[PDB]
Design a protein around this ligand. Structure first.
Ligand code: MG
Ligand code: MG
Ligand code: MG
Lengths: 330, 197, 198, 330
């Protein structure tokens, strides 16, 4: 059971990476090939692991180019027998947990937060959990502590406006690769890059804001709200939550491009990687101006608008560099 | 073809930034609740950083550690203009960390009215991996939360260098325009004549 | 507070660009018509520039003068990837001129897959004023036209430097994708630890 | 009579600068304050000094914030009596000349090119001219040589597809400052910058490509033409001609911003100047890719599109920096 994460990543990519590594797959190729922006008004949940997946499964959307699928399960009762059966079938359950009830988490008995970890072994008295999020932990916790975390109400918490008020609900994710992975050859990487670019350039049809046009409209909508209002506060909470895993995917996609630049000695892939990382970095300015405004009432609409505009410009530049990369590999 | 060179001794000019400190990124065990390194109220452990006012080197580069006050121990970056001794410079050195890794611009202002935008990347404070080829300045064992000391969670500070290619007299800098970015120290390195040995 | 630094012994690596020469920016009086420094068929006068293959210094920085052929005496920039000896570098030094001053990107490629875009400015060949605080490399008395030598019209070449801030092993550079920009020579300066003097 | 030019400048800014300096005006302030992009389909002439001025006079548009104006004149007859009378009235004629017929020009009896110079003295036998364009000349030429240049048919020339086929037509420009100049104080510089930015941001009329949106449409139209076609050739000739004085104005505006940065120690003006110079430099990439395509059949549509996109992105960035500069002086 391998701990895997990145400094831009959440428990979402981390837990899926652990599951993928167990089944002999390369998480950088599987989770790093896709790169997109989507925001559905009203879709977001106050969870560290929120990602807009519809119509795909959560794992399906995060591994768009692989036959990778997930199903959400809600366990009835007050025990862990459903997880015992999953482990016996060779599944690594990804459990919805509240950090408040996890003894190894900094948030233990301090702050409520909707989180994911991997369960890899269960005894009569202990649940063995794997959580790569700093500070990384792998080993046994008391059954009572796991049950408290897995069954947590995760009530609204003044110290966590982003990831509280989202019950664990004894939810767990079952992931499976439903066939052999595509060969990640030069032609495949070319097709992946061209499909990502085409999807970024495509105008969205309706209420779901997708790609470069969608991001422009989303950021314009955000910056139009009056700072300090209920509408602005809700919008900044949404921004911080959805942008974590969108930023994480940007970081992973840059790494995917760097990995293939080295393997094949194609400088265009490394140049495109720098472009994609500039988008990952551009998200920081937007997310953290938003976070400081939401939590500490540091209202800086000019700085937010500036970071938003820079992020859009970085994305425009990245798409052009990716087309040069696609030409070089295909 | 390879030829040996010789460069004369430059000067280091350690910039007093005590007047620009506007954020608490570091706490003692006695004032954990004052940490504002991020939205979550984390901070560097004071015990795992130099004494305020002390002279340090990081990879040989000298820095003065800030004389912190209750309301400031670093510059949270908001495009602050920093006056420097007028001179010909090769490099800017920053001790810095970012709320997630990010990139922005340090402007160098020249006496002829030219300004150069110099790109600067700063890596994560939260057990960060260097993304911009920085050197590690400090990697702590622990991190401060509002209500407790967290064991086995590194807080990371980076040594970043920024080239000043223009042959001209620089008179001031502008720090990045990003609330994500934190500057703990600033040192400039003067130009030094290089030639064949 | 001012503190003394240390003297250092950096190494210069003079890059052989003879295989990448794709443009004639320099002519003798017999082949004025071959000049392609600009759209107008101007060129540097060969008689006021170093001998092909010769070692020169410009402001103390060493360069090898290109071994020109009939169809190349410089790199006209078209995004050429230039392999450099693996190592840790401080500075790229170029002898360069532009068809009007311009600025673009040299990409530095590192062995971990990081590529850094590095800003480069190159000033005008046509009796130019340095726009980027470059040093004068050559300022000729004359300029070549397709049909004549022009007296009292300086042709200007610049010594431009580009910082390589990343602590990492660089393996190659990509030159700008700009027909305006001309590189006559390329010298890399290795990293040399400079510290507070003991 | 003072020689004045810049390495990005043509005889247009040069001759006007000489006329301004004679009347005790700062050409950097007068010709550097304005900054715009305009292109009227069909307006351009094959002349080094073409600038779209309508509805203002040529000098009026180039000195938009000053009571500076010009009138064109076509001199009847075979002599220089009109120019003698103009000089006697204290006027500095700017003469439309063909470099083919100017002994001090590199192009003498080699290449035809529609050019401007200053006439400052006329005797029975000699016309004293001032021409700051490299290589700069000031002094007497024979009357016969001036008349040949002033009356030149400037026929189509295979060696100059940009500035040939525009007869001199004994044309000359008279300039006058018709009122006192505005005091170029902090509030004035702020207003100049905001007016330039507002004009750049304005959606253009159907019949004239103006500002940032106009530049986008112009460059899109240009890149849509097929390299090597007569249509593309015509468009690249126009590009090189109109872009000379648009690029010159970019360089002058950057210098204007630098000068006031130094004057008042306001770094925002120097930072804005760097953004404006990046646009000046962006024009080099576009117009030189165009020039080599037009003259030497060096067809690089991906390069032209790349430079075009970079020029637009640099303009976007420059406008944002200029708004910070205006705030710092207003
Ligand atoms: Mg699928
Ligand atoms: Mg007017
Ligand atoms: Mg004021």
């Amino acid at each position: 059971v391998e701990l895997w994460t990145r400094d831009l990543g959440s428990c979402l990519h981390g837990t899926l990476a652990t599951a993928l590594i167990r089944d002999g797959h390369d998480p950088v190729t599987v989770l790093g090939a896709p790169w997109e922006f989507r925001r559905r008004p009203g879709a977001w949940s106050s969870e560290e692991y929120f990602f807009f997946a519809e119509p795909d499964s959560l794992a399906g959307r995060l591994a768009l180019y692989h036959p990778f699928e997930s199903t959400w399960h809600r366990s009835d009762g007050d025990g862990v027998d459903d997880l015992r059966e999953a482990l016996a079938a060779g599944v690594l359950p990804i459990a919805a947990v509240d950090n408040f009830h996890l003894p190894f988490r900094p948030a233990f008995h301090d702050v409520h937060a909707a989180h994911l970890l991997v369960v890899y072994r269960i005894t009569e008295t202990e649940v063995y959990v794997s959580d790569a999020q700093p500070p990384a932990f792998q080993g046994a916790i008391p059954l009572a502590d796991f049950l408290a975390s897995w069954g947590s109400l995760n009530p609204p918490d003044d110290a966590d406006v982003f990831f509280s008020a989202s019950p664990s609900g004894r939810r767990w994710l079952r992931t499976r690769m439903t066939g052999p992975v595509p060969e990640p050859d030069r032609h495949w990487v070319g097709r992946v890059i061209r499909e990502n670019v085409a999807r970024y350039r495509q105008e969205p049809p309706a209420d779901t804001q997708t790609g470069l046009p969608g991001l422009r409209r989303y950021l314009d909508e955000l910056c139009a709200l009056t700072p300090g209002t209920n509408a602005a506060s809700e919008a900044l909470s949404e921004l911080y939550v959805i942008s974590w895993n969108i930023q994480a995917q940007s970081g992973l996609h840059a790494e995917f491009l760097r990995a293939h630049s080295v393997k094949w000695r194609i400088p265009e892939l490394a140049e495109a990687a720098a472009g994609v990382d500039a988008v990952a970095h551009g998200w920081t300015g937007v997310r953290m101006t938003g976070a400081h405004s939401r939590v500490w009432q540091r209202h800086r609409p000019a700085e937010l608008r500036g970071h938003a505009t820079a992020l859009v410009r970085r994305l425009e530049a990245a798409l052009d560099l990716l087309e040069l990369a696609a030409d070089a590999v295909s | 073809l390879t030829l040996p060179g010789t460069a004369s001794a430059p000067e280091f000019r350690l910039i007093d930034i005590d007047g620009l400190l506007n954020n608490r990124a570091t706490t003692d065990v006695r004032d954990l609740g004052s940490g504002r390194l991020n939205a979550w109220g984390n901070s560097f452990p004071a015990a795992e950083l130099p004494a305020p006012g002390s002279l340090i080197t990081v990879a040989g580069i000298p820095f003065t550690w800030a004389n912190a006050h209750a309301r400031g121990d670093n510059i949270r970056c908001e495009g602050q203009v920093v006056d420097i001794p007028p001179g010909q410079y090769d490099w800017i050195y920053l001790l810095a960390a970012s709320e997630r890794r990010s990139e922005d611009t340090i402007w160098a202002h020249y006496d002829d009215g030219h300004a150069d935008p110099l790109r600067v990347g700063i890596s994560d404070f939260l057990d960060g991996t260097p993304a911009f080829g920085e050197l590690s300045a400090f990697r702590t064992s622990r991190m401060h939360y509002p209500h407790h000391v967290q064991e086995g969670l590194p807080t990371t500070m980076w040594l970043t260098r920024v080239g000043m290619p223009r042959h001209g007299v620089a008179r001031s800098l502008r720090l990045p325009r990003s609330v994500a970015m934190h500057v703990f120290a600033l040192t400039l390195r003067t130009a030094a004549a290089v030639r064949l040995a």
